[PDB]
Amino acid sequence: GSSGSSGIKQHCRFCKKKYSDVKNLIKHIRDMHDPQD
Ligand SMILES: [Zn+2]
């Protein structure tokens, strides 16, 4: 069919979980996915 949205919500890459608000995600990333690189 038509090309609308490909899933507004974002999905972590490290844990590969589901999140509603992007804001929460970002924080979550550096929260647990904080590599000492
Ligand atoms: Zn994550």
Side-chain angles (χ1 to χ4, degrees):
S2 294
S3 281
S5 52
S6 63
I8 302 290
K9 74 271 166 159
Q10 289 290 119
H11 309 70
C12 208
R13 276 201 285 188
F14 304 82
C15 64
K16 278 272 190 169
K17 274 158 158 85
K18 298 168 209 175
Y19 270 88
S20 55
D21 281 321
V22 80
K23 288 290 176 67
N24 172 351
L25 169 62
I26 300 150
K27 195 210 90 280
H28 154 76
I29 304 167
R30 299 182 87 157
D31 187 65
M32 295 274 287
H33 315 319
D34 173 39
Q36 62 188 56
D37 170 89

